[PDB]
């Protein structure tokens, strides 16, 4: 088949869905029992069975899909915060690069789903690897999703104006990236510099 601009936007949107589920699971944002094991990208992953969250993510993912297609979304951020104070403790950032020319493409692009799938699987393994060094979240936390766009006027009303919600004193490590040939997704996670080691 190959890669079209719409095919790519679906891949990426869907990646974010699985990416978010894995963060919320691995970081204990929702209890581990509100998650279920499924097969995706050739491995076993955890996705929510919480009905509100399912609905919420379906809505986000459908919107990202639309924005990615139009090259209207540059950053997707998962902000993890102390439920009491609102202090940001951990902040996962995805940067999205777009080939705006892919709209002019007369053929799907040559990259095997397998190839893309190997890339995504590598990125997800990496996300899993973070449990082994991320500072413990030692208070109860919630999450929030932010996006960054250049096209502000066409953002649906349901999306509220926001700050970037940076951590004051942070450490950040770069994760692997993947590419469809049309969208490239860079990842990283930042977190508050620990009190002591």
């Amino acid at each position: 088949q190959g890669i079209t601009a719409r095919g790519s936007a679906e891949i990426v949107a869907e990646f974010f869905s699985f990416g978010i589920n894995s963060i919320l699971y691995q970081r204990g944002i929702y209890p581990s029992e509100t998650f279920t094991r499924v097969q995706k990208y050739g491995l076993t992953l955890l996705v929510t069975t919480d009905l509100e969250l399912i609905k919420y993510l379906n809505n986000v993912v459908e919107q990202l899909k639309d924005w990615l297609y139009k090259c209207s979304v540059q950053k997707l951020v998962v902000v993890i915060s102390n439920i009491e104070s609102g202090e940001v403790l951990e902040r996962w950032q995805f940067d999205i690069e777009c080939d705006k020319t892919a709209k002019d493409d007369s053929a799907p692009r040559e990259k095997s789903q397998k190839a893309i799938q190997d890339e995504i699987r590598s990125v997800i393994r990496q996300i899993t690897a973070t449990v082994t060094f991320l500072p413990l979240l030692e208070v109860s936390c919630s999450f929030d999703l932010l996006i960054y766009t250049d096209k502000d006027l066409v953002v649906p009303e349901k999306w509220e104006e926001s700050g970037p919600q940076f951590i004051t004193n942070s450490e950040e490590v770069r994760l692997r990236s993947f590419t469809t040939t049309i969208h490239k997704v860079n990842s990283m996670v930042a977190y508050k510099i620990p009190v002591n080691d």
Partner: peptide, 11 residues
Amino acid sequence: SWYSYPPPQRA
């Protein structure tokens, strides 16, 4: 700019 879409509130 930055925009936010808040997750369901929890009880």
